[PDB]
Design a protein around this ligand. Structure first.
Ligand SMILES: O=C1CSc2cc(C(=O)O)ccc2N1
Length: 126
């Protein structure tokens, strides 16, 4: 069902949270080789999460589930904010700009924390 597809998407999201926190520790410790690999892993995870979310939204639309569509439109918009910040973070790492990397990292954490009540609402709406 769409509900079980959202639970699968939620687990991919939690995987990115786990890898992100490990990446943050590596960055603080100066282990740039690890950071580079975690950033590659996160990019793939975010790509997979984004695709699952789009399929879920499209399915809610085909089902006529107006409330779930509203919430998923809001959630996918927030996802793109987080994705844009992530990409800026990757660029900061490439450029060796640790000040910008720190900035974007904290921003991504706050964008992600804010979006959590909506994430839970979607599970209940589908
Ligand atoms: O979605 C976002 C990304 S930037 C952002 C920055 C800040 C901040 O600098 O406090 C707070 C909330 C925020 N919400």
């Amino acid at each position: 069902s769409v509900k079980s597809e959202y639970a699968e998407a939620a687990a991919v999201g939690q995987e990115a949270v786990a890898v992100f926190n490990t990446m943050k520790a590596a960055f603080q410790n100066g282990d740039k080789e690890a950071v580079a690999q975690y950033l590659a892993r996160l990019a793939s995870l975010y790509t997979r999460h984004e695709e699952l979310l789009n399929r879920i939204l499209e399915k809610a639309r085909r089902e006529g589930n107006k409330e779930a569509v509203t919430l998923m439109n809001e959630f996918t918009a927030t996802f793109q904010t987080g994705k844009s910040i992530f990409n800026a973070m990757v660029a900061a790492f490439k450029n060796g700009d640790d000040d910008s990397f720190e900035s974007y990292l904290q921003a991504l954490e706050k964008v992600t924390a804010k979006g959590e009540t909506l994430a839970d609402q979607i599970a209940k709406a589908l």
